[PDB]
């Protein structure tokens, strides 16, 4: 059984991608839920779990069946504990892009997520670790990271830092195997 992964902070998206691209056997993603209509070639239980009733969803929600859920284009979307669960049962780390909120909800399900926080040392340090952004994008990212840390520090399984993404990525991989057992 494999603990799901929640990576937070600057470059978490590249981390998320690289783990998948490098270790596809050890990592995967769950199927999300949505109210919105199944399109032409789309598939129930592959693209999404589609829910017919906007209410049945809301019923499943408050019952806590979802670790995170929300509204887009006047339709609903969510990540069920279940869909996550089936990924984990498969022996695969479930890559999650979720609020730190979902971590509590995740712990509560006896699913034991590894929540890693990539910590920017400064503004400049964000620019070292992500070379595809402007100073101004970096300021915003450094600020999101400061609130994030200010708020959710205790939800973290680990905190990683580095002078390059390479170094960060390495720590991320170390942490995951170490806490995997």
């Amino acid at each position: 059984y494999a603990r799901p992964i929640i990576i937070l902070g600057p470059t978490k998206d590249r981390a998320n991608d690289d783990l998948l691209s490098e270790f596809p056997d050890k990592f995967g993603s769950c199927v999300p839920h949505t109210t919105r209509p199944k399109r032409e070639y789309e598939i129930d239980g592959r693209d999404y779990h589609f829910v017919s009733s906007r209410e049945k969803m809301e019923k499943d929600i408050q019952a806590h069946k979802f670790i995170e859920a929300g509204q887009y284009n006047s339709h609903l979307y969510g990540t069920s504990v279940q869909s996550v669960r089936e990924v984990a049962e498969q022996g695969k780390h479930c890559i999650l892009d979720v609020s730190a909120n979902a971590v509590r909800r995740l712990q509560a399900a006896h699913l034991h997520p590894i929540a890693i926080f990539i910590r920017p040392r400064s503004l400049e340090n964000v620019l070292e670790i992500n070379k595809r952004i402007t100073e101004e994008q970096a300021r915003k990212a450094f600020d999101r990271a400061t609130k994030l840390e200010q708020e959710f520090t205790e939800c973290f399984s680990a905190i990683v830092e580095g002078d390059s993404f390479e170094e960060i990525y390495h720590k991320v991989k170390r942490v995951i195997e170490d806490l995997s057992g």
Binding site: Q71, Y72, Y77, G78, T79, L96, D97
Partner: peptide
Amino acid sequence: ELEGGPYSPLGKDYRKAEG
């Protein structure tokens, strides 16, 4: 009220939502 990505609850539609 959702900003997320492939591995978010947005799933396949994350991209369309960035406009």
